[PDB]
Amino acid sequence: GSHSMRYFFTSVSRPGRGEPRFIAVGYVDDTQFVRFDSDAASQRMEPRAPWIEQEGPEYWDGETRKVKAHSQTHRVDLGTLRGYYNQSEAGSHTVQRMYGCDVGSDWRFLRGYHQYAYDGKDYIALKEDLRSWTAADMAAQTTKHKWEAAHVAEQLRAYLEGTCVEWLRRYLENGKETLQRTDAPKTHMTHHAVSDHEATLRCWALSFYPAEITLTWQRDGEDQTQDTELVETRPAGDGTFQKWAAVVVPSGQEQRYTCHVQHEGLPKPLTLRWE
Amino acid sequence: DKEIAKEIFNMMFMLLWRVFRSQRIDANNVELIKFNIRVLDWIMAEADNDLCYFIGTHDKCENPKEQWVANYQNLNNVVFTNKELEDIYDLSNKEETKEVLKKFKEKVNQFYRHAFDIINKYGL
Amino acid sequence: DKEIAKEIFNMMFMLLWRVFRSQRIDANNVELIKFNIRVLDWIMAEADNDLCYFIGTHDKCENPKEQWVANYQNLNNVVFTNKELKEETKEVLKKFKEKVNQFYRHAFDIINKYGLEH
């Protein structure tokens, strides 16, 4: 199906405790494949999926140079932004950056993105036309003008439509055995009394890749949000994901409830009922 | 000044993209690559000149100011006034120097034409 | 757009100063002057590429977007990833990559020396 490659950057100032923290991670789909942590020993881009370890020393030298250029400009950014908002030196602030590309089932470019946050909220973002900027406020507007002067949007479009898609494809081939696999969910169901006259049905889905999944409860063939508790999808730690959905049912009416599981690893969606 | 330094850094990479974006990498593009290596050298050299003139001056550098004065002056005379520049050649290189100065003056006139045509077509 | 043209004009003359200000004119600098004539061609060609890419109602021109995509992609491989794309060409490429690495170190040394307050 469709694929994406995404890089996530976090930059935290630590006033009175030294250098700002810098962390970079890269993903293909829901699989991390690289990391950089300014606090680690290596001071290098590091592998986090086994199909990237094959890349030679030149590649790793190259990604380390580029991430270091990211780290150092983000450090300047923290001061610049402090000045834009007239903030004291004593407070810690956070800069976040996310960029990457999507490709369709035919591996062709679909969309690219580049987003920049300050203190947890949108600062400036590249629009889907890969030409213009969304500037959240008057500080972002100053950044927008500098970024227009320097043709930042054109650099990003050139990367997003070329390098980003070229190297996404390459990772998808080299990591074909895992990245292009689908692990269907292993499903089951639990039951507990929750009151005098009520019980909880919990519909489980374990060991699934990719992470995208739909779990819905139906009572008599109609979907309900009521009593429906859906936990956020969580990582198992081994490359797969977990999720559950719970519904509170009047004790004695369990057989009126069905859980529906939709996942791309499923030939057809599943129907589970308490037995 | 941190701001001046930041602006010089920023200008450096602004120009790097203008070099990179039109740098086709072919065989028989080896001369374009050699030209762009020299352009990157000029970008770096001019950044250094800016650091020396502005930013306190970090003392241990030759202030470009007097060179800016003489070079502006010789250029106004080569391109516009046609007043003679003295001691710029001998008999063995008089002709090469006169030829390239003429080529140069034509290029500067063409540059003005090119730029002001842009303002005529879209700026007014 | 009026403002786009004005910015492109302004960038042309801003760069012309940077070319003019360091060029000593005499017979010892004939090769410097010839290089600078090419740089002046380059400034003019790039201004034309900006007009083609950024201006709404413009005449027929070759849109540079696809060469920008391809050139970006090739340079990332030449300088950083080393993914493969005679002996003379591979030698300028090696010199080019060394120059780009030196460029980075030159720029971030300026930030290190004067742009940080800590």
């Binding site: 580029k66 990211h70 932004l81 500098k146 | - | 950083f80």
Partner: peptide, 9 residues
Amino acid sequence: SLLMWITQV
């Protein structure tokens, strides 16, 4: 593969 460089805000 990372972007080759980023620009100051």
